[PDB]
Design a protein around this ligand. Sequence first.
Ligand code: BP3
Ligand code: BP3
Ligand code: BP3
Ligand code: BP3
Ligand code: BP3
Ligand code: BP3
Ligand code: BP3
Ligand code: BP3
Ligand code: BP3
Ligand code: BP3
Ligand code: BP3
Ligand code: BP3
Ligand code: FE2
Ligand code: FE2
Ligand code: FE2
Ligand code: FE2
Ligand code: FE2
Ligand code: FE2
Ligand code: FE2
Ligand code: FE2
Ligand code: FE2
Ligand code: FE2
Ligand code: FE2
Ligand code: FE2
Lengths: 287, 287, 287, 287, 287, 287
Amino acid sequence: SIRSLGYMGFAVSDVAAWRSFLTQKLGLMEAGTTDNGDLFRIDSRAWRIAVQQGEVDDLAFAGYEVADAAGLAQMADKLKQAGIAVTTGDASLARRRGVTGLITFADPFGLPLEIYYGASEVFEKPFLPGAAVSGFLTGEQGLGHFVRCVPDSDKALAFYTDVLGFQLSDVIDMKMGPDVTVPAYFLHCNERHHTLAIAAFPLPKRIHHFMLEVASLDDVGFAFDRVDADGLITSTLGRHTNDHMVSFYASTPSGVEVEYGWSARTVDRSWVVVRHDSPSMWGHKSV
Amino acid sequence: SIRSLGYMGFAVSDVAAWRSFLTQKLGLMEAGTTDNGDLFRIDSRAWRIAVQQGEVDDLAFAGYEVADAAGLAQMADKLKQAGIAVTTGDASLARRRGVTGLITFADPFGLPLEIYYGASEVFEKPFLPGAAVSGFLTGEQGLGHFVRCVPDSDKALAFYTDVLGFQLSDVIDMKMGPDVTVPAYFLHCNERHHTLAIAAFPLPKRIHHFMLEVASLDDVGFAFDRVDADGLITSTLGRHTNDHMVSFYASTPSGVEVEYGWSARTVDRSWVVVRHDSPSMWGHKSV
Amino acid sequence: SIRSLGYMGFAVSDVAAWRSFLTQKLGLMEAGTTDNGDLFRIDSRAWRIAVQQGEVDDLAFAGYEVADAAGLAQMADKLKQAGIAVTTGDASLARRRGVTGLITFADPFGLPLEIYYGASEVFEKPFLPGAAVSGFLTGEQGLGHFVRCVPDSDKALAFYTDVLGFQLSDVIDMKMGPDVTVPAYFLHCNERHHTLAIAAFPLPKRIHHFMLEVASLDDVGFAFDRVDADGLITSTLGRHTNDHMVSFYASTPSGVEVEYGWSARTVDRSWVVVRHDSPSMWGHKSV
Amino acid sequence: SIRSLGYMGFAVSDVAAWRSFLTQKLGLMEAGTTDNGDLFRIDSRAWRIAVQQGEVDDLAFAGYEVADAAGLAQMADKLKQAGIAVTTGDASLARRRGVTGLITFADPFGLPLEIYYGASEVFEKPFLPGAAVSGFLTGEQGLGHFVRCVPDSDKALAFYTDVLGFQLSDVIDMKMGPDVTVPAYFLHCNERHHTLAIAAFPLPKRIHHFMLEVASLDDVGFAFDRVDADGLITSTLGRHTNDHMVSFYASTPSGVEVEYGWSARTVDRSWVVVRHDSPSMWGHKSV
Amino acid sequence: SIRSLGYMGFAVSDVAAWRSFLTQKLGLMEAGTTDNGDLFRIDSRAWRIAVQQGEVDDLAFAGYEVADAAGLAQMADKLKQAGIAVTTGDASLARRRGVTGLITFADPFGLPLEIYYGASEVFEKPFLPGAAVSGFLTGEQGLGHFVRCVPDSDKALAFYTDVLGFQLSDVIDMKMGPDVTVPAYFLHCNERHHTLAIAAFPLPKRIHHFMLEVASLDDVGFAFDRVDADGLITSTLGRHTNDHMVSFYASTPSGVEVEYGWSARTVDRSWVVVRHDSPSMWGHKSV
Amino acid sequence: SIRSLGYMGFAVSDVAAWRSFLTQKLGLMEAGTTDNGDLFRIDSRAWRIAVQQGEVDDLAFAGYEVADAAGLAQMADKLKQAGIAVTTGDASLARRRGVTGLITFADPFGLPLEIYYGASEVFEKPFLPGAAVSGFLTGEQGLGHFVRCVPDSDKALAFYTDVLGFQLSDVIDMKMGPDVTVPAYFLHCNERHHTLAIAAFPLPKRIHHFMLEVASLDDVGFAFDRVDADGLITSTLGRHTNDHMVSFYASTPSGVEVEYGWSARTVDRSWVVVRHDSPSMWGHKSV
Ligand SMILES: Oc1cccc(-c2ccccc2Cl)c1O
Ligand SMILES: Oc1cccc(-c2ccccc2Cl)c1O
Ligand SMILES: Oc1cccc(-c2ccccc2Cl)c1O
Ligand SMILES: Oc1cccc(-c2ccccc2Cl)c1O
Ligand SMILES: Oc1cccc(-c2ccccc2Cl)c1O
Ligand SMILES: Oc1cccc(-c2ccccc2Cl)c1O
Ligand SMILES: Oc1cccc(-c2ccccc2Cl)c1O
Ligand SMILES: Oc1cccc(-c2ccccc2Cl)c1O
Ligand SMILES: Oc1cccc(-c2ccccc2Cl)c1O
Ligand SMILES: Oc1cccc(-c2ccccc2Cl)c1O
Ligand SMILES: Oc1cccc(-c2ccccc2Cl)c1O
Ligand SMILES: Oc1cccc(-c2ccccc2Cl)c1O
Ligand SMILES: [Fe+2]
Ligand SMILES: [Fe+2]
Ligand SMILES: [Fe+2]
Ligand SMILES: [Fe+2]
Ligand SMILES: [Fe+2]
Ligand SMILES: [Fe+2]
Ligand SMILES: [Fe+2]
Ligand SMILES: [Fe+2]
Ligand SMILES: [Fe+2]
Ligand SMILES: [Fe+2]
Ligand SMILES: [Fe+2]
Ligand SMILES: [Fe+2]
């Protein structure tokens, strides 16, 4: 079974702007440049985010991690049985991603996805943030989460749950307008409240935002100010109703947003699905 | 499987008296009025207790919570296979209860029951008790418990255990008189020692009492005095022999009682069924 | 499955001597006299040890506790399938033992055994030791343990493990003499290192000793002196090699011994079977 | 299933040198001499390492521990079904090893292996290190680990995983030279990150090294100096990238090395396989 | 002010017997031989007990530790003002004791005493007990205690309290016989309940016993057996009424006894003086 | 009274080499350049180490921190009463150091010293190490320590203790050669075992080394490798006998060394002065 979101790749028009944004604003660590693009780290892994030159300015691919070769084989079989076109990653791609083995395919609406096992650790190159950040929260919870924008949430939900195995945490009926309410589905694959969210938002991108979690409230507070200095804040500090994360949102150079948060609650086998009519307990004012 | 008791609805002759009793005496929070009646809260849920106008002055319905849609479907199948008439809650009822989906049916002796999933949370409307109460204990243990009065405890026990899946915690042979001893069965569906009790008591109501648990001994002590001021106490402070809860009992405006307690022990998979000849270790004197 | 040793009954020639020994020396609580004999307590249960008048001066019966009625039914079936003569305890016997249901049978060498569920708790009659004892250790670990003396340990081991479900903890090859070594088997049915031990000792009784565990080292130290005052000590203070319990042994009025200890280690699913050539790390000198 | 590495036997040309090295340098306890050779202890077990006279100067055999007789029988069946020649250890061998039962066989490349149950504990002969060592870490993690040198790691990996049941923790691609990279596989059978490692190293021995873990950093620091005084250090203090153990390596009298470490992290069912390009985060400089 | 008892020297007729007794029986560490006699350690200090050849077979001297040079000067002045003959330890004596500075004098009844500062630590020669002992308790509590036998306890008490600054912990009126009761005074100079005791016992030595405290009950239990094997035990295991130490007593080769214990309670500025009529809560039977 | 060592200034011939060494090797944070020279941080303070251009290549000045203005006035009076020439720092110097007030003077052998109060904090410019360092240990313990080299340790000791108020922790008689032993004095002014050490070493500098303490063993391990890559290590990893710090030593561009350590023990009012014959328990081999 999928254990977590392991990495993400972005294809952007301004690579230098993304490099500055990720390191100086968010605190990620520059981890070199390879055929996989410019690499960035947040922990012991060789890389978590890759930035490649591309006019799409959006998420180019996402990789989900399984525990071992057997787990990869099981997921491959499930995808094929579901009628999805699955391709074994060649040696060239595996080396590019720094993984031992992987398979590639696309979700119902075209997002290129990868499931891999045996990623590269680089403990001998100790993590050093590009900005003052006490640390990022990963471990068994993976990289963080992203919100997939789709035209048919029922179809997307069925794929991610029935085929990929994600489990529903809760639903938030997002008020878009007096006569517009759209359900946002939050799904987990480990203890992180959600690793993936699905919603039918009117955005011209594959995702609304990706999220990175830090270890202290100060990490979030300082980052907010670094981002605010350039007028990139899109939402003030607030705490979510479902995962109880304290965070803020900001614009990346591609328009797609990034959420930066701290202190979210986790889920367990005793969790029960619920619904909400608001995404925030307090704060998160649109600015 | 059923995870907990999620909500209760009462049909009463004096709605204003119940509103005052629940808020000023017990400390519940007024949560508005809808087609579901006057709503009251004790935690993050949109409502836990509803009060509607009705001459019955008794419990009108109770809702048990399952983890998700799959759990609701499984319970529906079990009930049908057992020969119980099950009805899918229509969109109108689901909206009234603020749940995502639910089924309705009645227990062997006419109590309307509902099993639902996906109830509404309102973290954005922080809980504020109507009286000085540090907090109510809910979470994975649900709302609390109620004691179902029936004419045939063996039949009721079989339904709640064999069909609904409740598990026996223990039995207390209640001395009613020199030649009258009635067994009271205490059942659990989660860590709470009991979410439901069953006994053949000579009462003209569906339940003898419902119980709410608070976070501190002082919450109980102060509440006792607020209730005692109006001469509504039915039992002095005491601690039960089975769940070890420290509580007192009082009369609601409908005659049906309410138990208000603190510090009960929980049960686990290592629990063994036992019997008792007394319901109280100390206190709980009838007054 | 059997969850623990729940009670023991002794048939003795000097009932008054046993009453004095259990209360004044060991600290048990006198719990009245019924058709079940004189009753003694060590915790919240109505009784753990019964003493009846009888010329045998030995263990008369032992009762093993199961979790519920279903567990009793399962054990009954296993015993019958194994060819053992099983008898349903009549209402008269159940009332005598204060249990809800029970079955009776004998082990391969004649020891009367009982398996029951739903024993009586008496929290309303708070435990008060007959001597200065901070408390006895029971709970999920039951009453303690006893060592069954048999002429064929292989046959006894097969019955208790294959039929009753006990699991082997370890073996101690007891040096009886230059040319005599006898294996003692220690078996568990819960976290207590052993609830039953089996050995082919040259003793004219069904058991060599029964053991009760207390909460503090002082409980053991004080008890040792109370017993030593009457010259009843059989072994000095020592700590066992297998369960690491610190204890001493003494003679009951029936010759059969009693072990009184503190601080034993428990076992879990990660436990591995081992062997020992000595029963004591230190102490336990024969006196 | 195999629960841990329980013991190791070495056949050496200089028995006196090994005795001095194990006791004075590493701190093991001399535990007598039997037909099993000179015995050495690190904990409550009668012995963990045996040294016999032999011109091979290498590991002579290794014993893996199972939980009980049933576990031994299961492993025997698995080995036979896999086509491996299995021999039941005779009474003479069992007594020599101090175990209750065992089976013998060889791995694909000739290493004599044994799987046993019921080893001997000697708590009555309290462990006393031969040098200043606060303690060795064993328990459920067993003796420690050793690295098996083989000519075909794929074949060895298949045997140890598919037949013996070991599980992969991670892989380290060891840089041997500009055009030489060899994968080292680290496998676990309990919480210890690895109990066995497999690699195709150009060494004329069955193993590159065996490892013993101690309780404090000082235990390692002091040992380093005792070994360094005789010029036997092969690697300076360092911390590994995979198990995060802080250790140093040194030469035994047989050339085969020994790793002495502290503070390694453990693995659980939530562990995911990863890869590394370096075996050390810091230190471990070849000297 | 005096901070603790730092060391003791014994003059014995059988030096080899004392060496064997201290190391093999009690677990002290042999620390070489100098002009100060044979040295023994129990912790990081270069030595705590010295054994010299002498026909007296008794305590030859005791050294009390002060915090620094200023503290030594203050004590010297207090002793002189009290009329005691004080001598500055010459360079030769300081080197012999391994201290920076010291003064010498005798108590009212001839016991040679020394007060010093700046003793030698030897952390680079890690403590290794001569027997299986997890550790000795020293630190701010010093070496342990000894009981000074005197013909006039009032005179001795006045000297140790008024001149040396010891403080009374409690008094035990020791029953020597039907018409003989002698008060034993227990005094502290730090957190240890007592570092010195004073009593008028009919013994031909300067002290009745000296005491060493260990870290675990097992340390005491194992030591008891090592001593008992040679028939040297003088008192069975017991716990004292005043300091609550669990210990046993044994004979040294000089007749003077040694107490070996564990788990004593400490004293603070909130301590109040009390009296006892017995020295033991349980145990400590004369054998 | 002096509360801690607050800052140090170095006058060096190669400012660029020092900048690279402090940031890339040790992990300090570049904090700008002012008339105070290039500034470096290790915590919330605006600066802890300053580097100015100067041919001396040695410590140029050190600043000790007092709690407030009253404390500065008290120290000024003590110095004057002792006959030391004290100068009030002018507004220009205070601004240069970023302090509220300070006085200047020299120790007996020419080292320029300063005592100040009210230094500048810059929490709004969160600390970001120049290398992978989890953190430096400062707080109430100040910057760390340095070892003052002098021709007459008795004279220096008298000044620092009698005039500045430092307190002796312990003494280590350093073996320089067969006929050369020099005492090193370690002094504290807060919980740090030593903030200053004094010794008569044959070095052409004011100090032998300064020391910085980090939060993890890995911080030290990684730093060791960064320094070793340039062949600057002077001592291997080891642990000191007196403060028990685990550290290594390396050469700065000025020849003067730097000690980088972790896990030292602290001192309290219960501390007693002792002596040692070795500075290291293990390691610290000269290379
Ligand atoms: O806040 C946002 C989240 C995701 C995508 C866009 C976006 C990006 C490019 C062009 C237009 C839009 Cl709305 C955006 O503004
Ligand atoms: O992590 C989250 C938890 C709850 C709600 C949102 C959210 C908020 C605004 C727009 C879209 C989303 Cl998915 C969110 O990003
Ligand atoms: O204590 C009680 C618990 C449950 C029901 C009633 C009741 C309510 C109305 C009329 C008569 C009775 Cl006994 C009651 O008095
Ligand atoms: O929570 C409880 C635990 C044990 C006993 C009772 C009780 C007490 C009196 C009458 C009816 C009942 Cl169910 C009870 O309400
Ligand atoms: O220590 C003992 C344990 C069990 C039984 C007897 C016993 C009891 C009665 C007669 C003879 C004997 Cl050996 C006994 O002495
Ligand atoms: O609880 C125990 C643990 C280990 C050994 C014995 C023991 C000791 C002496 C004789 C018989 C037995 Cl079972 C014992 O009673
Ligand atoms: O470091 C080593 C690890 C394992 C084996 C040998 C060895 C032993 C004997 C002869 C030659 C060699 Cl390379 C060795 O030197
Ligand atoms: O315990 C270990 C963890 C990671 C790597 C090695 C290692 C290091 C050098 C050579 C061979 C090996 Cl297996 C190792 O011994
Ligand atoms: O138990 C004892 C404690 C202290 C001293 C002696 C002793 C020693 C030598 C000769 C006579 C006696 Cl009583 C002793 O026997
Ligand atoms: O440490 C102790 C605490 C209390 C009492 C005694 C004691 C016991 C017997 C004889 C002499 C003494 Cl001082 C003792 O040694
Ligand atoms: O290790 C050292 C510590 C302090 C000073 C010097 C030093 C610096 C410059 C010239 C000569 C020397 Cl010995 C040095 O080498
Ligand atoms: O922090 C320390 C603790 C103990 C000893 C030394 C030391 C070691 C070598 C040379 C000079 C000194 Cl001050 C040291 O720097
Ligand atoms: Fe989000
Ligand atoms: Fe889940
Ligand atoms: Fe109740
Ligand atoms: Fe249950
Ligand atoms: Fe026993
Ligand atoms: Fe088991
Ligand atoms: Fe290793
Ligand atoms: Fe595993
Ligand atoms: Fe004593
Ligand atoms: Fe005191
Ligand atoms: Fe230093
Ligand atoms: Fe001090």
